Amino acid sequence: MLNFIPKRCPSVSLLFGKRPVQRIEVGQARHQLEIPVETIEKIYEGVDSRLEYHNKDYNAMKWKDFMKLKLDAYHLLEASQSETAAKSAL
């Protein structure tokens, strides 16, 4: 994934927080996934506003947080690839 976080201003992302939920399509099969808007808003605390790209519609996160996120993704992916993975995240 890229470090491009869409601006939640209505001129860019119309209707961001009008409802308490976000939805996304995942993969080639386009599975649906719903995510709480608070879980999402947790990103805009690490978002950095000095940086703006792609027609000034996307900000960038701080590398610390972005790489923590990438590491969680990578851990999940390698666990999926492996077979001795733990049956729980506890």
Binding site: L15, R19, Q22, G27, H31, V37, N55, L77
Partner: protein, 253 residues
């Protein structure tokens, strides 16, 4: 300018020997939005029919609890809504936005059954329907139109400008540029016409082979990137699904 759009389709175009034609109009002219850089007053205006939208608006306002807005907008819009013509958002784009931002299936189905498939929502409609500012809705519509800039936009027609000075300068150009033996030179006939004609013939004969041989690598890279994205997303999704049932331990305890 940035390349806007959410599509992964690697698209190239081939050209014809015919120009784009639009219906005759004595006051409007069609042009590219990025090449024109138009303003709100440069955009052309027209009148749109209200009722089909005013019914849905009355419903939404009775649901949300704001009828002053409906009354004001209806008194403004009677005898048709006068609005810029090529500043709109399509029903499909609006539905995608609603779905990804969390509007309920009931509301989405209401939208679908209420409006036709080829309906075009303009920024005043969007603003009065979502309690937003017409400025922000205008900017959103402009971004969504620039995402699909192959479609020309309709501006107010303006006569040409500076024709007399341009005529003077073009006369000066010819007077200084054709008073010579350049187009009759041995250099011309030996290098300029042969090299140029050979380049033109080779380009016309291998126009597509060259393009394909150049675009092979970019196509392969785009394919690889998309495959990697898909596989990673799927793996993460299925693993989180596996670990989704690790919260009930507490309420069991």
């Amino acid at each position: 300018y940035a390349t806007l759009g959410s599509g992964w389709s690697f698209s190239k175009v081939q050209y014809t020997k015919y120009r784009i034609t639009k219906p005759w109009t004595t006051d409007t002219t069609f042009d590219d939005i990025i090449l024109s850089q138009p303003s709100k007053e440069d955009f052309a205006k027209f009148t749109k029919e209200a009722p089909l939208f005013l019914r849905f608006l009355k419903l939404v306002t009775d649901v949300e609890g704001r009828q002053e807005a409906f009354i004001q907008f209806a008194k403004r819009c009677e005898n048709g809504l006068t609005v810029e013509k090529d500043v709109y958002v399509t029903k499909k784009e609006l539905v995608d936005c609603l779905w990804k931002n969390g509007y309920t299936d009931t509301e989405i189905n209401a939208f679908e059954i209420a409006f036709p498939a080829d309906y075009k929502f303009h920024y005043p409609e969007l603003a009065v329907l979502f309690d937003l500012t017409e400025e922000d809705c205008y900017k959103y519509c402009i971004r969504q139109r620039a995402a699909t800039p192959e479609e020309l936009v309709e501006l107010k027609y303006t006569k040409p400008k500076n024709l007399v000075s341009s005529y003077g300068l073009c006369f000066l150009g010819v007077w200084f540029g054709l008073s010579n033996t350049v187009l009759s030179n041995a250099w011309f006939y030996s290098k300029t016409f042969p090299f140029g004609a050979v380049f033109y013939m080779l380009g016309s004969y291998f126009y597509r082979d060259i393009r394909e041989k150049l675009w092979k690598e970019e196509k392969s890279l785009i394919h690889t990137a998309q495959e990697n994205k898909n596989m990673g997303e799927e793996s993460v999704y299925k693993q989180m699904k596996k670990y989704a049932t690790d919260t009930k331990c507490l309420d069991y305890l």
